[PDB]
Design a protein around this ligand. Structure first.
Ligand SMILES: C[C@H]1O[C@H](O[C@H]2[C@H](O)[C@@H](O)[C@@H](O)[C@H](O)[C@@H]2O)[C@@H](N)C[C@@H]1NC(=N)C(=O)O
Ligand SMILES: [K+]
Ligand SMILES: [K+]
Ligand SMILES: [K+]
Ligand SMILES: [K+]
Ligand SMILES: [K+]
Ligand SMILES: [K+]
Ligand SMILES: [Mg+2]
Ligand SMILES: [Mg+2]
Ligand SMILES: [Mg+2]
Ligand SMILES: [Mg+2]
Ligand SMILES: [Mg+2]
Ligand SMILES: [Mg+2]
Ligand SMILES: [Mg+2]
Ligand SMILES: [Mg+2]
Ligand SMILES: [Mg+2]
Ligand SMILES: [Mg+2]
Ligand SMILES: [Mg+2]
Ligand SMILES: [Mg+2]
Ligand SMILES: [Mg+2]
Lengths: 64, 117, 55, 6, 88, 100, 6, 6, 6, 6
RNA sequence: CGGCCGUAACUAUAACGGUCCUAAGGUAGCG
RNA sequence: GCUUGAGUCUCGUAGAGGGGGGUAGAAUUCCAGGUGUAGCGGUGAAAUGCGUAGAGAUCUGGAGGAAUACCGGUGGCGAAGGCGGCCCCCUGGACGAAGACUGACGCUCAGGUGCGAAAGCGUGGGGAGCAAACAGGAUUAGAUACCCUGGUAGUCCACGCCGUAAACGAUGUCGACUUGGAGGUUGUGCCGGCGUGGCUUCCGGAGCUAACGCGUUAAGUCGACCGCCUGGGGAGUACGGCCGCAAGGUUAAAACUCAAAUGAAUUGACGGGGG
């Protein structure tokens, strides 16, 4: 888990360089089991990606 | 009649059938063929081979356009996904892109009931 | 799964890269999962069983 | 056949 | 819930001290404040059953505290229900 | 209450955005509010098209305001055709640090 | 109930 | 056969 | 033991 | 903790 | 908004079978 | 009187807890066009069905409803029923750290009251997809089915009703006590290590249990209070009451009849179970 190692308080939806690490080429959110992220940060990460997708900072899919 | 050069091969690989449609880059159909229309019914229709023949026939349908490059859009779970792309490369087309365009709902609609076979 | 084929590369390599990328997205598993409606009871039941066997 | 039923 | 300042006002009014937060008068006054506040919520949100269970706990808790205070000291009970405008 | 407003403008109306920011921040400050952060990000490539647009002019604000004036700015965003999309989020604490 | 169809 | 029984 | 049950 | 289990 | 013919181990009836036709052969209820 | 049970206050934390409103993207269907041409669809195989009045395919534009992929987890939250995109508004509970406060204010609870999946019912909306009924096509000795093509109620929304489910952990609530191990999740004190709370999953010890198993989240050892059982069938039926618009719910017998019914486990045999 990068977020516990860095001591991130909350994952920011606007921090797209960070969030791009936790999505596949398809655009799908990567599991915590794969990335090794903590459960609490995975939930923040999910919410962040979903907000970024709403604002069109990330894609929902690789096929819009 | 007039020459497209750069085409798109749309492969609709259902479990029952394969439809191979070749379009221009703006999605206007040039020709098409199907496994069901290539002399394969029932069990034979849902095979990789019948999709290959459908691909080969679709290449013949558009030979008058003189297509060089194809970008390949693959759709559906079917047995004729792979063999169609191989047949097109073998038919002398240059495969530049291969894309999966299989529609996946982000939930939407309730599927049909499970079959009690 | 979106493969752009690169210069000076066999088709069999380029196509196998497409085959490998479709396995990754799980698009065919996803399609088989959505052929028929699973009731929530059935979905929870299989989820339970998958967890117990892994354990 | 039978009364009882057969 | 009640705000920090709305809570502190009630502790000042009904308590014997700024820190007298445990007094039965203070406890009943705080419950009464929030019960009264939530009458507006449930007028709008009639099918918020889950929140209403919390309100009915406040009502029940207030009843038990008032029943305690009545039998412990009837004079303070009579004073308290007059201030807060309770029927009993 | 603290809020993190993002809004996106149709990239033709990039000229109107310094105008817009002045008007909306005036609505905040005229009801005893603060602009903690304010970042005109400018025109960005959208991850997907919105109303046939492939770009939009993004504006971040972080604001301390009463609820009512933020509600009113959401309605202003709704009825303005230039604003293609907006997100208003509650934050716990006031945000002033440079955004990513 | 029916035999005839109903 | 047929709803009618067959 | 078949078709018939076994 | 008391109702939840303590 | 139908016929026909057969069929239960007392008889009787026929849940059952076959058959011909119809756009469909009258259901619940009632008689 | 007391503070140890039970509460209150302060600060913080996690959460699909609830109610209301808004909105996003994917997909299905439909509509209107463009391209295109003989099939599509479906199945075990078919056929019904759709298609030269140009379908299917593909592209563009539009309409509308419903549900929220991934994240996602014997993960979380809720009294239970249940609750899953994102955002806001209103709102309930839980937990932790330090204190400070009240001073037994507690536990349980017949009757009562409220909440209560799905289906169903009423009135008014809505209706993409799905789909009881229904229609046609198959299969078959028959096939009122399973399979196929369609398809109405319904599923959705508002308000009201119903009050039941294998509503299950088939395990009432509260409190105390009694070896361990491995995890998950969520706090918190201290210098990745050491603790220390909450919630939760699996294994297992004593003990308990007919056995299966349960095993500090007990089915162990105890205490408080409540609910309920008394052979199988007849029957959760009848009659009466109460409730319900109805469907029905709830309370609840008797005659008669049988010498069993039943639970767990054992050896076989058997399986269109597996190796
Ligand atoms: C396949 C059939 O299976 C079932 O009937 C079986 C019967 O066909 C024989 O094989 C034996 O008597 C079995 O013991 C029976 O269980 C019964 N469920 C009816 C089924 N038949 C059909 N659905 C059909 O013929 O159609
Ligand atoms: K707008
Ligand atoms: K009592
Ligand atoms: K319908
Ligand atoms: K034994
Ligand atoms: K009755
Ligand atoms: K008896
Ligand atoms: Mg909350
Ligand atoms: Mg319902
Ligand atoms: Mg209705
Ligand atoms: Mg259907
Ligand atoms: Mg059907
Ligand atoms: Mg019951
Ligand atoms: Mg349940
Ligand atoms: Mg259960
Ligand atoms: Mg029970
Ligand atoms: Mg819980
Ligand atoms: Mg055990
Ligand atoms: Mg026992
Ligand atoms: Mg009854």
């Amino acid at each position: 888990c990068r977020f516990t190692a860095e001591g991130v308080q909350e994952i920011d939806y606007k921090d797209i360089a960070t969030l791009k690490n936790y999505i596949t080429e398809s655009g799908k959110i990567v599991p915590s089991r794969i990335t090794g992220t903590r459960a609490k940060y995975q939930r923040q990460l999910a919410r962040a990606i979903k907000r970024a997708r709403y604002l069109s900072l990330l894609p929902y899919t690789d096929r819009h | 009649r007039k020459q497209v050069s750069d085409g798109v091969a749309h492969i609709h690989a259902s479990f029952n059938n394969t439809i191979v449609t070749i379009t221009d880059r703006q999605g206007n159909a040039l020709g098409w063929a199907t496994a069901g229309g290539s002399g394969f019914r029932g069990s034979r229709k849902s095979t990789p081979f019948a999709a290959q023949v459908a691909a080969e026939r679709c290449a013949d349908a558009v030979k008058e356009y003189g297509i060089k490059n194809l970008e390949v859009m693959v759709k559906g779970p079917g047995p004729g996904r792979e063999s169609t792309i191989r047949a097109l490369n073998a038919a002398g087309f240059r495969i530049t892109n291969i894309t999966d365009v299989t529609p996946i709902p982000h939930x939407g609609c309730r599927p049909p009931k499970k079959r009690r076979v | 799964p979106v493969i752009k084929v690169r210069e000076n590369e066999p088709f069999d390599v380029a196509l196998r890269r497409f085959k490998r990328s479709c396995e990754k997205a799980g698009v065919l598993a996803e399609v088989r999962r959505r052929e028929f409606y699973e009731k929530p009871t059935t979905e929870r039941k299989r989820a339970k069983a998958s967890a117990v066997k892994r354990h | 056949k039978a009364x009882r039923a057969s | 819930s009640l705000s920090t300042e709305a809570t502190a006002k009630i502790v000042s009014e009904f308590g014997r001290d700024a820190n007298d937060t445990g007094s039965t008068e203070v406890q009943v006054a705080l419950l009464t404040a929030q019960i009264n506040h939530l009458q507006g919520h449930f007028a709008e949100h009639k099918k918020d059953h889950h929140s209403r269970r919390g309100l009915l706990r406040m009502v029940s808790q207030r009843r038990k505290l008032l029943d305690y205070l009545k039998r412990k000291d009837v004079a303070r009970y009579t004073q308290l229900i007059e201030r807060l405008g309770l029927r009993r | 209450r603290h809020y993190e407003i993002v809004f996106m403008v149709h990239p033709d109306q990039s000229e109107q955005v310094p105008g817009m920011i002045e008007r909306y921040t005036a609505a905040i400050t005229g009801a005893e509010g603060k602009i903690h952060r304010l970042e005109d990000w400018g025109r960005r490539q959208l991850a997907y098209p919105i109303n046939k647009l492939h770009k939009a002019h993004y504006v971040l604000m972080n604001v301390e305001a009463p609820q009512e004036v933020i509600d009113e700015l959401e309605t202003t965003f709704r009825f303005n055709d230039a604003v293609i999309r907006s997100m208003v989020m509650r934050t716990k604490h006031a945000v002033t640090e440079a955004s990513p």
